[PDB]
Every structure is written in structure tokens, then in C-alpha cells.
């Protein structure tokens with residue numbers, strides 16, 4: 001059994017709870033297993049947080065209200081859909097850091113890297129970890145789903161982490177700490193593949209499953225880890241193929257563009273065809289593949305209405321889930 005999931009960037013692009021409910025409808029209709037809610041990135045933190053000071057119980061253009069989010073999860077669970085929270089650490093973090101800035105400038109200066117406003121100081125900084133751990137406790141609580149007790153998961157990010165190649169062991173140790181927090185609440189931790197190196201893989205908690213989206217190149221020009229490599233060190237992977245399984249909804253796109261996307265997916269997509277440097281659709285023969293996901297990234301969706309978002313996403317969801 002392979003899982004199939006949809007991942008929705010609700011950070012770079014605002015989504016009503018109704019749009020998300022209709023998306024989950026389509027996921028359930030076609031026998032999908034999960035939806036991944038990428039709600040924290042540089043542009044915005046798009047759910048409600050006591051801890052960060054997003055409390056309004058009223059609908060708004062910034063974040064899902066607590067009850068909105070909780071309604072969405074209850075809805076998804078009723079359709080046998082697991083909701084997987086996705087909070088991006090330690091980079092892609094400007095959104096909630098700006099919230100910490102406004103809440104407590106002193107704490108902000110104690111946890112932000114000296115060089116990036118998007119990156120939390122993962123370089124062995126205790127107060128950075130403590131802040132994150134509190135934010136994670138709130139998030140683990142919000143996404144509690146008793147129907148999926150003992151199968152819940154959370155994406156902790158780990159993608160595009162500046163400094164992580166050179167300072168690999170600090171990256172890994174940080175990822176292990178936040179892994180530890182979430183295992184405390186019985187979730188399985190997950191992260192993107194891209195910032196983990198040969199140096200780091202031996203120290204990484206193998207409780208992590210990996211979201212394999214694109215094989216990285218080291219600064220030497222050498223090839224970074226592939227799925228076999230991850231298999232060799234005990235890591236399960238999921239195919240998030242950056243070509244076949246990524247799509248950026250855009251105002252410019254018509255019906256014919258969506259038709260072309262579906263014709264492309266017909267040949268480009270398979271459950272086990274990952275994006276390797278050499279072959280963008282590389283068939284892999286390992287035993288560590290657990291599923292796949294189509295992902296809607298939000299950063300081209302600037303001028304899309306809720307309706308036009310549905311019009312683009314709904315058919316791609318259906319096509320992917322039936323391939």
C-alpha cells in the first residue's frame with residue numbers, strides 16, 4: 001500500500017476554510033489518504049496561535065481561526081483523511097519570527113540568526129529551541145486527531161537551510177531535538193531531503209521519514225543523497241517529485257494549461273519515480289518508499305480568487321489521485 005496525499009501551501013496564499021473543505025472533498029472522493037497543511041513559511045504564519053498572538057476568533061485575510069482550523073480537521077477526519085501539519089524549521093520561518101519580534105523584541109534577537117531574518121538560530125542555541133518547542137506544543141495540540149492516534153505525522157521542514165552544508169551537525173542536532181518534542185506527543189516527524197548530507201545522515205534520528213523532492217548537489221559539485229542512500233541508513237521516503245508533483249496555481253493559467261498539466265502527469269508521474277540529478281523521473285526499486293504527494297505552492301497564486309483556485313486545483317487533485 002502506497003499513500004497518496006495533497007500538500008497545500010496556505011502560507012504564500014490565503015485559503016478560506018470553505019475552499020479547503022472543497023479540496024478535502026475531492027481528496028476523499030478519489031481515495032486520497034492525507035492532506036499536508038503547509039501553514040508556516042517566510043510570507044506568513046497562516047493559522048491561529050495564542051503563543052504568537054494570532055487570537056482573533058473572526059475570519060480574516062491572515063490566519064485560519066482556531067475553530068476554523070479545528071472544524072477543517074474534524075471535517076477531514078470524518079472523510080477518513082489524516083491532516084498533517086507542516087511547520088517549516090529552521091528556515092522558511094520569517095513569518096512566525098516577525099510575530100515573535102512584535103511580541104518580544106528581546107527574545108527575537110536571542111533566537112534569530114545574525115545573517116538571516118528567515119532562519120531560526122539552529123546553531124546550538126538553547127533559547128531558540130525553547131521558543132520553538134512551545135510553538136510546537138501548541139501545534140501538536142491543535143492538530144490532535146484521535147481517529148489517527150499512533151499514526152499522526154508532522155512535517156518539520158528542514159528544506160533550504162542556509163549554512164546547513166558546512167554546519168551540518170548543528171542542523172542535524174537541531175532537527176533531532178524538535179523530533180524529540182513531537183515524538184513526546186506520539187507523532188512521526190518528517191522533513192525534506194535537500195539539506196541532509198552524507199555527513200549528517202549517521203546522526204539523524206531515523207524516526208524521521210523523508211519528503212524526497214529533489215536530489216541536491218554538494219558545493220563540491222558531487223551528488224548528494226539519493227533514495228538508496230536514505231534506505232542504507234534506515235530512512236523511509238515519500239515522493240514529492242519537484243517536476244511531476246509540484247504545481248504553482250497562477251492567474252495566467254487557463255483550462256488548456258491545466259489539460260496540458262494532466263497530459264504531462266500521465267507520462268511524468270509514477271509512485272516510485274523520484275527527481276534525481278540525472279533522471280528527473282528516476283524509477284527506484286527500494287523497499288523504503290511509503291507514498292507520494294502532489295503539492296500546490298502558493299507564491300504564483302497572488303491574484304487568484306477562491307473560485308479560480310478550485311478551478312485549477314480540483315482537476316489536478318483528481319487526475320493525480322487516479323493515476
Ligand SMILES: CC1=N[C@@H]2[C@@H](O)[C@H](O)[C@@H](CO)O[C@@H]2S1
Pocket residue numbers: 092159160192213297298299
Ligand atoms: C521543499 C521546497 N521548498 C521550496 C518551496 O518553499 C517553494 O515554494 C517552491 C519553489 O518555488 O518549491 C520549493 S520545494
